[model samples]
Target: TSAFTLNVRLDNIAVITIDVPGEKMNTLKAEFASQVRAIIKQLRENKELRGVVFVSAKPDNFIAGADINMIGNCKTAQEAEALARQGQQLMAEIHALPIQVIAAIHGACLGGGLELALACHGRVCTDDPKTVLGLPEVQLGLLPGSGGTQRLPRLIGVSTALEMILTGKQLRAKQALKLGLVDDVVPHSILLEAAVELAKKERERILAGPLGRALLFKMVGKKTEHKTQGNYPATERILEVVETGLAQGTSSGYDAEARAFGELAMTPQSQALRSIFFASTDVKKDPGSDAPPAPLNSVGILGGGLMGGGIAYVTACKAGIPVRIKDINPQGINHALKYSWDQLEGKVRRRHLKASERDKQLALISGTTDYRGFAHRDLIIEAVFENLELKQQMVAEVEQNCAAHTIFASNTSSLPIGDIAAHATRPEQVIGLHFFSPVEKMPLVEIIPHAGTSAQTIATTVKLAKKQGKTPIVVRDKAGFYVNRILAPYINEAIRMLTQGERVEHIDAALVKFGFPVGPIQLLDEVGIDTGTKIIPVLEAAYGERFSAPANVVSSILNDDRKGRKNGRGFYLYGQKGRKSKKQVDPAIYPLIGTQGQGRISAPQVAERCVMLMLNEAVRCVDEQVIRSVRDGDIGAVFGIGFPPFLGGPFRYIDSLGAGEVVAIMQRLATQYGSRFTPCERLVEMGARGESFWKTTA
Candidate 1:
């Protein structure tokens, strides 16, 4: 009753505004059914009512779907099933009403919220960039339960609906309008007016005929089958319910939806994914310190290479902050400017940005060849080459030119932040803000604070990274930090497999099948073999022989002048620019590494050896406090390195395969391989105590 309010207008239209007092975003709860039903009952009785309009009062958020907490609090599958049915019944009432109803949606209309919108007679949404529409329930490892599986296919056509539900992709306002997901897109000020106008006019139901629907479902089913490949049972079930609805009727589909929802909610896959969802929300609120962040309105970039260009783009385009690019040469500065301009131009071509708006955003970024504009910078990030003394020199230069409070951040992938700031006068302001390659796309940023770094500095950099649309994890200033620290050993183990006669393609394919975005060898090729080779000595010095680079693996690739995709050749031959061709394995790579033309290992064993080494090192990181918490560790691995989301992260995967079992596997592998596979002390103790990284409650 407190979450929703009914307001009847003089024009005979009943407007229901969902505000959800005390919450920034609205979410449906099982307990809110009575309030919604009461409003529906009142509207049904009013003979003067012409239509209804449902809307949210929140600034930039519609209902964010059902309250996940309510689902998490369910005591039994029956409890969850009952909740789903209640939602279905409410949506059914909305769908079968005598009068018209319009969903005046703005901001994020997702999950059950999108289902509610689909149930309405029409939808009108704002054209704001923040207004995203989607049914993202499948990301939580479950299908949409509140009549979504049944109604969406009928509304948007089965093919498009299946793609949206399967991938959980959010569509922008223009995209939603183009796809017929929304009837109209208007400005925020006229959103409700457009919905009211829509309510005043009657529109015929849009659906393909029975035979056409049958063909639609049939083709989409084949496409979905190809996409899922048996990895997700829920995806197959989603396809089944939609097909059932098209074949049988809406009621049967609704029944299947509720049943599947109840069953999937209890599944381990759903549970793990839900935990990730909760952990991500929790991490966003964490600044990693109690101290408030220092004000950061302007930023400076120290290089003009790929990494610097990417950093500059995110700062100007995403964070909406003024940026000054300082490079050694005018050409380098021009390259950085061109990088930002090209990205913005692509958006302009796509009609995502107006030409004038692109100009405004471009004007925020200015390039320089010296320290002229550095004095006003609140934060300066160095993305120069990974030379310890060079980084130290930059730190001193920043100190000399910038304000005393200006934070100096290094985008160094391997060097220690402490060592980078060793020659600095204001060492407290120097911290590591290591961003991944193609920084505009990668979400995770490793925020490494050295011994002399202040809490305020960590908080400020974390805030700045978040503003640039990144998930920042504060880690210890150790060699390779967290992501690369764990990844180095994994890549080495894969190379070792190759040296032991594993074929290039098999090693890559094994890990790809194991659920990484790409295999280790393929990633090495993508990251450039020379770049991978450079990190080895840093790791070897910090972790000893365990982190040693595999013999001839780097030599074979680099000596041949193969630097991966950046060049025309590497482990795999990239056919040609803009040509769609499969990457052919370079046969010349075999003899150089003392291997023949073929492999000598099974896919499962290859994946096992590589993953075990990675998992063991991730555990070692936790024990050494390089990573702060298991949640951060899990997120960093998943977001930064593409650890399997389905398996959760290293810690969650370890928990699933009991710690005792994991330790036992490592012990067996250590005897067969070397001490590199030896279980870390934390895991060994966890095995003895039968403890999990994440403790479970009954």
Candidate 2:
């Protein structure tokens, strides 16, 4: 009864409460199986007991998931497989209990925890928002190993089960009930009562017969295949295991699930993803400074464009802080106000927020065209145009109008933070917070502090960003910062390739197949050709050579009045006034860039040429201390630029390839392309020592 405590009622009902010691949330570990088996034996010995209800002692969580650290510690695939089989056997015993057992799920019953719930005869979860159920092993490049592939399809329809497992999306209590994943949903106070009631009522097994299940699998398989397109091997294996189980038998399915889980755990894709998981966990605990941050109660936002509007929304909505917006004109103020309104209104319409809640959040945001409300602001973030003088002017104005302790943060993508703070009255208060476009959607915010910036400012900004539901990574003040520094070179290489007569569509398809959400060419279209080209001068001035762009290509694209999708023309043509589809490559782009169509390069070669430049630049960033650590670099790349989470990030990708191999590839590419592909000194040293970028102490 270490993890499980039993209390018997006079009515022959036993309630088993699970609470793991020295942990905030309960998780199933391999060692916990014996204790669970002991508890089951105890239940069987009590002949008078008619039913058992299992619940968590934790106020919020039932079982969060399996201990991932344990999985990470497994030295071999066979060890991981053996652990999966152990879990499968334990769940089978629970499923075969003589007396009915009901899972009283309250919060975050996911991964192995959901598998345990599936083994139960019935499940009833609380109607709390915290109550979420899922098997999110797919996100870590794994599938549920403990009878999930077999039991879930048998419980829910094949299509629904596959959709949930493939995406690793967590379902709320209402969704779980609708999908028949949980037997019932009740209030938190009555969750145990509902679960016990369910255990008392005997029910027949609900499953689709072979004929119905086969048709469901076939229809779902076709849809899934079209979407996945063999990009994720685990996704395909999940379908195969579920299909084989439904056609063959439950035992066969369990075997396949465990075997697949073991093999998938060791896959390079899984290893990379797991590294990201660990790195993210590490970063979450970073305070950015040893000292505590100063209090930040209110925020001031300058500008009301898309970036500023997003900053305003997250500040008021997510952080629950009062926000004052200052724009140059009334229309800009109105635009930010409208931006906040549209976002909150959508949430209310979707029933995600109440009308009263929307009003409360709206009340938190106020807009002005002057510094009237900036006198008491604790932090003022300028999301203005990328101009050093303009940003410095804003800094001076903030210092003059706001409190002496107010922090001035500029959301500049290319300009150096040091230059922005150069003319500041208190340079220690000035910092850089480079947020991505459509701020609320992106997860990363690069925190760049100038040499003169104080530690308190760094810590305070990091805390504020976290409160706004963003992951903040403290990086050094540089021209392009971390994300764009590496990204610019990658985009440059792709553009260079385009100039080399590679077809635009083929170049885009190569990176897309390499796991980028979009091709670099399409990304150029979305980011705006003008905007993309504008950053090149800053990068070229800061670094050299590698950041130099083809002026002819730039002049041609700009002179043609192609502002990318915004102007409905760039490398690709837009449909119906910028609908983004029903388009083809613009033939006019070829003669302008001094290139003609010749699609001779393979996709792998294209991806390698582009990503290698990106990876090499990322290493140089770390070497130059532009980023604090390789962990930060990886997170910034993955969350900032959609750098393929399956590869982990630039750092992990290089690690997976081995530094020596990456160095060799870079040398090979240097020979094939130009000297721009030369590996950085850190990479060269690591390669000589036969070490990985992650393993080096420096």
Candidate 3:
């Protein structure tokens, strides 16, 4: 038998070190159980041994978990059940031994390793922040099966154990110690010393206390409410088995855990979640050629308004790159720099960073009125005004000052990347790294590549965007690229609804209930009425009257000047400085538009009207090959916009609602609200064929 090695020390203490031959992290795998069982047998046979400790030979991993691939390869529920039981039996064997067993844990004591530790006599773990402990099986769509359900509740209370298992939350050394999850948290240097002391201290009275006696006879009694509360069924099952064992007997709980583990092994939710896990992990390994991530050491930001300042903040503080801010005037540059300082100061206030560290991060940024440091920039992200001629001049300046490979990414909302790249010497190097407002917090970054963009350019920009901790979606150049394109028309429809006397707040509230993060008018008020106001004409020229702005919207903006949070006077009134204003409709502007009588419309129709506009455009983009795959389209919409994640994206929405049903809904809406609601040809074809977006396999 081959497995982790065990050696007897001269002091009569046995040490077992787990080390897989070539793996970076230690994990329990098939074919290793017999060897482990053999080691346990040898340890049991040693009459002279006073105690034993199980530890990892790996540098930073006690044991990552069971091999995920092994679970994925299971052919039947019974087979998975048998595997779970084998692990349970091994942990049971460790518990039943008269000699004390201690787990000297360091690094990632995760999933099954933590379960194994719970069965030991005592656990002494390293206090290093890197030494994390948790039962994270739920992340893989499974519950802890190797005696964790029974033993964790016995060690900690039922509520705490359930929370940990169900949420798959990892705890640091201090947190684990506070929760009584580990016997002692010690320095990695003294981990073995602490474990030996714990074993020695517990040798005489470890299994004889009141707590021990209660745990020894634990069994199922009265059924306790598992608190399902709309949580996963398997999570409820975990609590049920623990409650059963605590009320009845250990045997019953173990049996229930093994049985339920087997059943869930073949479930569809488990498979889907597992697939998503792997897909997310795989995408992080560079999306293009294996040339390694782009060498972006320093970055430059142009323009000094809120957008430019936000860009500078993220680059300096989050990306840890020194930034140079350039604006036409000194006050604008000062405002931009102050914005970065305020953002970092907020982090200090939250205890996320020490005051000194915040200052250190702040020192990474410096401003200039000219392009003095621009020559040293590895990348330049320009968020200046969207004037075409001004952009052309900036593009020319970047070409002359920056390196040929230094990517110049524009943050234009609706302008096509090809048009922006038209004047650049190396147009292929120009890409759009479009970030939403409040860049420090927003998660999505649309990587818009024009006709001149090379694959390497797209790959580099994607890598750089991800380095800033943003989900980068590569999209072909189009009006709105992916997000704003759909958003523009949807906002236009909202304005149109307002023109037809649908109350502004009511229309916004209807879509909010439909799962949008914000209402359209509220979004308009926040984006600054002027910013969205100008984009309407650009989109209308590109896509025609379906994207036309509402007549009253222009009149309302002119009357009130609520250009958004910037002007502090959009759809909502501006309050005291720094405070978010109340959402009461601007009464003065309403008189100009005249109260278009509040029409009574169904919530479903309102949702459809807005959603059909987006879906139709997404389908058209797909047909034009602006989006490469349904996955890209889905991720772009869901991440870039506030499209509900659970519904997937537009493509997944079509699949869930069914093609024919979606087409029928759009057709009815088009009849009611003119041609804007007309379904795209892609949807019409799918409806004709009675098909969905995804092809399923058995």
- Best candidate according to TM-score: 1
Q: 338-372, model 3: which lDDT tens digit per residue?
A: 89888877763434346778889999888988778
lDDT of 1 by residue, 1-698 (tens): 28788888878888899988887788887767888888788888876788889889998698899877878887677888888888899889998889999999988989999999999989999988888888888888888889888888778777688888888899998889888989999999999988898898861232456666667667767776554435566777787877787778888888988888888888777887888888898789899888899988888999996678899999988999989899988998888889888888886455647777898888999998867878878999889988899999998898889898999999998888888878888888999998988788899999999999999998999999889989889999888899998898899888887777878888887776677878897898888887877888888888888887666678666777888878888877786557565767877777777654256578888989979988988988889999999999999998988887778788899988888998999999999888888998788898898688887822
Clashes of each: 0, 0, 14
Alpha-carbon local distance difference test for all models: 0.85, 0.85, 0.76
Candidate 2 clashes between residue pairs 3 or more apart in a chain or in different chains: none
TM-score of 3: 0.78
Superposed by TM-score, candidate 1 places the C-alpha of residue 217 at a distance from the truth, in angstroms, of: 6.2
Off by over 4 Å in 1: 203-229, 576-581, 596-600
Model 2 lDDT per residue over 1-698, tens place: 37887898777889998899778899887678778888789888868878999899998699988978888877788988989898899889999998998999988899999999999999999988788999899888888988888889778877678888888899988778888999899998888877788888762233456666667667777776656556677888888888888778888888998899888888878877888888887888898987679888899999986667899999999999999889878888888888888898886344555777889999999998867878889899888877888888988899999999999989988888888999988999888887876787888999999999898989989999898889889998877888888888888888887787888778887887787888887888888888878888888877888887655788777887889987868888775566566556777787778665476678899998989888888988899988899899988888888888888898878777778889999999899878999888788998999577676322
